[PDB]
């Protein structure tokens, strides 16, 4: 039901803004300059574009010299309420040359 993120400065998306969307079959990534919605939608004009509970998914995001790096890990878990007590290390997914300023972000979820 959780599926992605929006990042940027203004988040109007006339201003450039990273979008990341999982759609179960793929991960889809864009930097768009099209005016986005007031409130995000996932009902059941971009300079760059790309395409690839009992469980926990972890992601680390950082933006350095216009490279947006992503690291991740997936695991089973037995407490839903709190972050797990044990130790694990995330591994690099991607290292994206998007070239954009980022100070604000939001998350995307599927809707009835």
């Amino acid at each position: 039901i959780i599926r992605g993120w929006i990042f940027g400065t203004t988040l109007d998306s006339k201003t450039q803004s990273l979008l990341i969307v999982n759609n179960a079959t793929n991960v889809v990534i864009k930097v768009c300059e099209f005016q986005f919605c007031n409130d995000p939608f996932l009902d059941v004009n971009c300079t760059f574009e790309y395409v690839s509970f009992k469980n926990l998914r972890e992601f680390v995001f950082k933006n350095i010299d216009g490279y947006f790096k992503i690291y991740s890990k997936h695991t089973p878990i037995n407490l839903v309420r709190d972050l797990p007590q044990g130790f694990s290390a995330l591994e690099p997914l991607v290292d994206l040359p998007i070239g954009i300023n980022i100070t604000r972000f939001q998350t995307l979820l599927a809707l009835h």
Partner: protein, 49 residues
């Protein structure tokens, strides 16, 4: 005049940062609200090639 250079105000680029219009990043002290006179319009030009 199809070849352009962008600005001359406050904030300046990180390495491989790209910069684009959406609001008038104006050319002096005062807000402009679409004015192009004193302090105003983007500090954006073209080369006389």
């Amino acid at each position: 005049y199809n070849y352009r250079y962008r600005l001359f105000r406050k904030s300046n680029l990180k390495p491989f940062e790209r910069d684009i219009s959406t609001e008038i990043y104006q050319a002096g002290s005062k807000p402009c609200n679409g004015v192009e006179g004193f302090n105003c319009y983007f500090p954006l030009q073209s080369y006389g090639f």
